[PDB]
Design a binder for this molecule. Structure first.
Ligand SMILES: *[C@@H]1O[C@H](CO)[C@@H](O[C@@H]2O[C@H](CO)[C@@H](O)[C@H](O)[C@H]2NC(C)=O)[C@H](O)[C@H]1NC(C)=O
Ligand SMILES: *[C@@H]1O[C@H](CO)[C@@H](O[C@@H]2O[C@H](CO)[C@@H](O)[C@H](O)[C@H]2NC(C)=O)[C@H](O)[C@H]1NC(C)=O
Ligand SMILES: *[C@@H]1O[C@H](CO)[C@@H](O[C@@H]2O[C@H](CO)[C@@H](O)[C@H](O)[C@H]2NC(C)=O)[C@H](O)[C@H]1NC(C)=O
Ligand SMILES: [Ca+2]
Ligand SMILES: [Ca+2]
Length: 339
């Protein structure tokens, strides 16, 4: 419906600071003891006039457990209030139905769900939406298909606020990392042997091409021992020079079927590696994760136009796995931006 003029940017974290814990109010004491039960929560959110909504970064926490739905599609299950859970999803352009099944699993114990939904719009702006008293709930188990847009929540009661981010029985949940590096690998060209690699630049390429789906947004987390520059479909996304502080990016304007991620990474001397995690959202509400591994292509002398999407990859080798995230010399302590 809308032209997307947003361009790749530094990733913007969704925060919980304005969000509220909600439950049903079966106990009128907020943060009070509640029965073992499952309860539904719904909120129809519409885009401000003239803007189209594209995708969302979501952080959700629960006491005790939750299932998160968008426009009837299950996008995540999780549990716990000490640390939020990160979710990413593509959106309909003008309205989106968010639905959460929350579960209290311990008798006589508090119950609640808290979520923050950072919507990104076609024009490059964003707005956060939160769980609060405007959500609808029921003092009963969730009806069949409670999460589908076709269910009528007109006669549902309002959710009851259990507490605020900074004033609740739970205290403020810690934000999770935007994406895990656990699961990815430090990779390099195969001249990386015995713990070091030659001085110089190396290039890496990964193409994602699900021709029967519509890709919407990508989130990228990347770090390199020494420095890198990152490209998507030939356009520059960003660059960094730290292997202890990782960078996160949002790509809001993906091509619908074919996207090439390319990295020029440089070694100043000593050990070398590049590591990344990429999440792509699809318009059917599914996602896929890509990590640096041996399915990337790599080359030791970088050719002109190493970044364009459709170059000939003859003479590119499979990238070498230096080690899974955590290996020496870099270890497991990478600083990762908050989701
Ligand atoms: C991506 O989509 C999938 C399915 O829609 C989600 O992953 C699966 O579902 C649960 C929900 O968290 C995951 O914990 C499991 O690891 C997956 N199922 C398995 C391994 O059998 C995932 O939540 C989505 N990611 C988002 C929305 O960021
Ligand atoms: C969420 O709200 C939107 C907007 O209030 C609803 O969309 C409207 O639906 C009516 C009835 O079908 C249409 O006549 C309007 O043209 C729609 N407006 C817009 C701006 O799309 C939407 O149906 C609601 N969704 C749910 C699940 O309640
Ligand atoms: C790949 O990355 C390296 C480092 O960022 C680039 O090398 C730089 O090239 C410029 C010329 O435009 C020099 O002025 C800099 O001094 C170089 N820096 C370093 C650290 O060597 C290289 O040009 C990039 N692109 C390609 C295609 O290799
Ligand atoms: Ca509980
Ligand atoms: Ca080095």
């Amino acid at each position: 419906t809308c032209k997307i003029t947003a361009t790749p940017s530094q990733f913007q974290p969704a925060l919980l600071n304005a969000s509220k814990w909600i439950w049903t109010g079966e106990n009128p004491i907020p943060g009070g003891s509640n029965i073992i039960s499952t309860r539904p929560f719904r909120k129809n959110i519409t885009a401000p006039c003239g803007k189209c909504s594209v995708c969302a970064t979501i952080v959700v926490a629960s006491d005790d457990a939750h299932t998160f739905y968008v426009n009837g599609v299950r996008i995540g299950t999780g549990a716990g209030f000490r640390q939020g859970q990160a979710l990413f999803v593509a959106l309909q352009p003008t309205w989106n139905l968010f639905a959460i099944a929350g579960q209290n699993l311990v008798a006589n114990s508090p119950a609640g769900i808290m979520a923050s939904i950072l919507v990104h719009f076609s024009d490059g702006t964003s707005e956060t939406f939160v769980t609060d008293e405007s959500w609808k709930t029921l003092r009963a188990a969730p009806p069949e298909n409670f999460q589908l847009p076709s269910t009528n929540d007109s006669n549902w009661p309002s959710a009851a606020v259990q507490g605020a981010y900074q004033n609740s029985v739970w205290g403020p949940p810690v934000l999770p990392p935007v994406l895990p590096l656990r699961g990815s690998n430090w990779i390099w060209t195969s001249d990386n042997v015995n713990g070091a690699a030659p001085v110089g630049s190396r290039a890496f390429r990964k193409t994602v091409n699900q021709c029967t789906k519509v890709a919407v947004c990508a989130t990228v987390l990347i770090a390199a021992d020494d420095r890198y520059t990152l490209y998507v479909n030939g356009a520059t996304v960003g660059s960094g020079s730290s292997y202890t502080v990782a960078d996160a990016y949002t790509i809001p304007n993906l091509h619908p079927t074919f996207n090439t991620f390319a990295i020029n990474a440089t070694n100043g001397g000593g050990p070398a590696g590049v590591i990344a995690t990429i999440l792509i959202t699809y318009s059917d509400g599914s996602n896929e994760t890509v990590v640096t591994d041996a399915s990337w292509k790599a080359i030791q002398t970088i050719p002109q136009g190493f970044q364009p999407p459709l170059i000939d990859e003859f003479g590119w080798e499979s990238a070498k796995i230096i080690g899974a995230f955590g290996v020496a010399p870099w270890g497991a302590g990478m600083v990762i931006p908050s989701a």
